[PDB]
């Protein structure tokens, strides 16, 4: 059952985008999505956080225990 | 005499003062909010626990003793 | 970097923590209440102004800078 | 870690230096002298003892 | 009399020493590194500048 | 018009007593009352405060601007 995530980048220039992922997707897949959306060029440029926790690539989305449609992943990008 | 946890809580308390009082742009408040969550996570306390931590008589008294030497 | 007024307010704030949390006998709380009024009178602030004084971002930030040196 | 009596005695010491150097008015000193006695009482020691 | 940037840079310096001495976990350090970048942004300087 | 004052001593052994005074009485008169009540032997042994203000003997009770019946004077006695 899909997880509707918001991906919010606060570093100027900010963005906020949305996408449905599977609970069985990994953090790596969310970074791969960001590259598909041309927000970055390589996964190494991207950090993702849930609240103050930096999320490692191997984590499964279901491990985050986010809500089905109300949660936001913070995006840090260093080119 | 402050522990690194107490110092972290003071720092979170300072940024919270700025955000609560709207002493910064909305984008800057968003950045400090991320920073406060990261600090809280790093030092092992809940952000909502900070007031309680700094509010103990014991902390106030020890910190006062540090100040008065 | 704390002024004598700021230090006095910290002292009042410490005694207030003890009285509010009932960490002292009722007679001892009566004594600290007299002490808090005397300090406030001596340093020229209202006892009810203490939270505001210690609550300024400016004070928090400077005190944090003192602590972090 | 400072005991409650030690904290009270440092506070009494701080006020005594403010009065002794005349950093507030004589009326202010009057009030701080009363404070010091109430603080000594609250924390169960004598002011002389500080 | 410390400016807001000065306060922010002292905070960044404090966290950098905690990370560098490994006083919290590697995951904690990850989080503090993100904090430091957000602090630098909030107060209008670059972290390298600190 | 009489001022009904409460005179409260917090230093152990505590007391709390009441007396009507005139607005034209002085602080000296209240200390004299305390001696009449055998709470002390000389006026020099007594300090009176309203909230945190130490009251000088020459002050008039009307100068205190107390309430007609709800105010308390703190009493410190050093034998």
Curated annotation (Swiss-Prot), chains A, F:
This is Ubiquitin-like protein MDY2. It is found in: Cytoplasm, Cytosol; Nucleus. Interacts with GET4. Residues 3-79 form the Ubiquitin-like domain. It comes from Saccharomyces cerevisiae (strain ATCC 204508 / S288c) (Baker's yeast). Required for efficient mating. Involved in the production of alpha-factor, the KAR9 and TUB1 location to the shmoo tip and nuclear migration into pheromone-induced shmoos. Present with 6510 molecules/cell in log phase SD medium. The chain holds residues 72 to 150 of 212 of the full protein. The gene is MDY2.
From Swiss-Prot, chains B, C:
It is found in: Cytoplasm. Present with 9424 molecules/cell in log phase SD medium. Belongs to the SGT family. Interacts with HSC82, HSP104, MDY2, SSA1 and SSA2. Co-chaperone that binds to the molecular chaperone Hsp70 (SSA1 and SSA2). Regulates Hsp70 ATPase activity. Required for recovery from heat shock. This is Small glutamine-rich tetratricopeptide repeat-containing protein 2. It comes from Saccharomyces cerevisiae (strain ATCC 204508 / S288c). The lineage of its organism: Eukaryota, Fungi, Dikarya, Ascomycota, Saccharomycotina. The chain holds residues 2 to 70 of 346 of the full protein.
């Amino acid at each position: 059952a899909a997880v509707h995530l918001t991906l919010k980048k606060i570093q100027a220039p900010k963005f906020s985008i949305e996408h449905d992922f599977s609970p069985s997707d990994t953090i790596l897949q969310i970074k791969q999505h960001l590259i598909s959306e041309e927000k970055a060029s390589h996964i190494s440029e991207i950090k993702l956080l849930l609240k103050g926790k930096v999320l490692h690539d191997n984590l499964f989305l279901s491990d985050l225990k986010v809500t089905p449609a109300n949660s936001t992943i913070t995006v840090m990008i260093k080119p | 005499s402050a522990s690194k946890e107490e110092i972290a809580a003071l720092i979170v308390n300072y940024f919270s003062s700025i955000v609560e009082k709207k002493e910064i742009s909305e984008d800057g408040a968003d950045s400090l909010n991320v920073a406060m969550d990261c600090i809280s996570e790093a030092f092992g306390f809940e952000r909502e626990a900070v007031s309680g931590i700094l509010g103990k008589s014991e902390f106030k008294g020890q910190h006062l003793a540090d100040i008065l030497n």
